[PDB]
Amino acid sequence: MISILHYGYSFIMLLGALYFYLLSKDPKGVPASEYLIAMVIPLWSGAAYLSIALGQGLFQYDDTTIYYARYIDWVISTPLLLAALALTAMFGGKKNLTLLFSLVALDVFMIITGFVADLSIGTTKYIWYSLGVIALIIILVITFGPLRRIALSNGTRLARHYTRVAIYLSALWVCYPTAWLLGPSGLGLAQELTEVLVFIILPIFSKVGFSIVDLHGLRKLHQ
Amino acid sequence: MISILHYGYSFIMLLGALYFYLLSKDPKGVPASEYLIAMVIPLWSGAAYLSIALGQGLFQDTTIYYARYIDWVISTPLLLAALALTAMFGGKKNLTLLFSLVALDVFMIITGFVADLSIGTTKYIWYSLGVIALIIILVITFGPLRRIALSNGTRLARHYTRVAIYLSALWVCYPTAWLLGPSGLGLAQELTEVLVFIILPIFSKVGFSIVDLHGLRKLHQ
Amino acid sequence: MISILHYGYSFIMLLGALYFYLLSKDPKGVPASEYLIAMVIPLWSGAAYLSIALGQGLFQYDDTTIYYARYIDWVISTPLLLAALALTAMFGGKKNLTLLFSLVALDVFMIITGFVADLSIGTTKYIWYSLGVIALIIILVITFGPLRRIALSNGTRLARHYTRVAIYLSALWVCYPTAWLLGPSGLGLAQELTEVLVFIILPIFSKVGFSIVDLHGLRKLHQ
């Protein structure tokens, strides 16, 4: 069932990428870079999850299963998602690449701390986990602080769309560290099968879902 | 023989980099970035192949030359960049198209490394994904990228078409040799595959850049 | 002792990053990118050295201890330091990104050759070491050649500050390959404890120290 679920995930990611390619042919005032980003995220995630379906993207550490392919996925896909968010706030204005790369730096560190925490035992696990959570808090502060102020400077309609997308992303992202802690990698209150379902359903909304809401909103500012 | 051949490869790469450095001192209207790219490719490839000569860049009932993938994951995207920048010579840069090719290429090389580590059907799933990546790269090369070259004048477009065919012809050889050799069906011997992955890169790296840079320098007059 | 020293290092790095964040609030004509770079260097280095303190960032190769976390540190931190140096030479003028990325390329190769040399035995070790030294020589030629000429073109006061920071960095950087050769990774004339102290004290002056001298000099040009 675990294998079948991952095949299904990869196929949905493929259909996501195809949809975003079609949208790109009729760009409606949205730069090609934002369509490229929306295509790479699902394609990369699909390939990583395919490696799990084929039983290559995991190994047995001590007496627990590490799905390391998830981290290979997230270390590319999550920074690209934060880029898409930042570029949404900056739509019709000057780009602030310093703020954008600050988010990329924080995000990559967040994902690495998660991978190391999964490979750690005892107290050490929760030291790394904690550093990742602090990284996520700072990303949220930027998202609702300076980045939201840039969105406001680009007009009411854009700011309203940015706020909607920011809440959508924020809501989904806080679920990842929560699920991680409750599942086998953490306290082990939740079963493997449960965690797998969560890390199949969340990414679908986090990747393909986010980009639909994000791109449709921007295309609507053109009509 | 395998070790000696790899030393010889690294030495030729060094001579290539030195030649491109000399050319850069008299740039003839070609941006410094295109000279830098032409220098990095051979130097990085030389270092990787050196690791094979010293017997570090491989591990073993089949021998995997993993240093090749470390080479290609840096050198091949840089080659596609040089190609893209050739199409865009004198006109506006389209970085979205350029980075699309870098994305496709890096994926192609990773699928190859995973296929080499895979057994049975799984090997050919990964191999297939890499081939599809190469097909799309070729479609971009002869489609949108060629249309940009045409928009920059007949002289530039003619040079671009020549370099595009040159690269395309050499690149299709890599997946073909991979499939026929030990990593695939095993119809060809290890020694044969080694010779191929010595001779092809010399024409793919040092050779491509000579044809590419000389053509662009000629457009100065 | 070795563990405690690494904890102390990480804490000092944290304080360095916090100081540079405060400075950034009153930027005094220094671009935000240069403040971000000064913050990332210590934060990344601190995290890497923390992995050593927890005894994760090292392993036993035959009869020697390899501190591989150092290389994970340097492969990110050293290119960013050369960027800060290059951006100093270019302060008030056009950026030359080709020259900047040439330095990044050389530096990354330098650090990789070092990691491979540490994993090598006999003559092979010193082949890789040699390639890294030649990389460092070319970096020094660029620093005091074309990069210094760019600094001159941006006025006497800037050029004087650049020359001071360039010498400071150059003096500290030549110490790394020297210590490497004399310590366990090389001829083994120096003991592990000695090498550890060197690779605690040097980075503090190389990272937090360099950025203080660099940023204070540039802030002074505002007045």
Ligand SMILES: CCCCCCCC/C=C/CCCCCCCC(=O)O
């Ligand atoms: C943890 C890994 C960190 C790796 C990422 C390194 C990030 C540091 C780089 C900063 C580049 C700054 C962006 C250039 C500024 C352009 C001007 C602007 O702000 O718009």
Ligand SMILES: CCCCCCCC/C=C/CCCCCCCC(=O)O
């Ligand atoms: C698949 C492995 C990893 C690949 C990641 C590559 C990153 C893809 C995104 C790049 C963004 C491109 C930015 C282009 C900016 C200029 C846009 C233009 O004017 O055309």
Ligand SMILES: CCCCCCCC/C=C/CCCCCCCC(=O)O
């Ligand atoms: C050893 C691994 C090396 C990996 C990095 C290689 C980098 C090569 C690419 C260089 C890009 C040059 C950027 C050109 C910008 C033109 C504008 C300017 O020069 O100011």
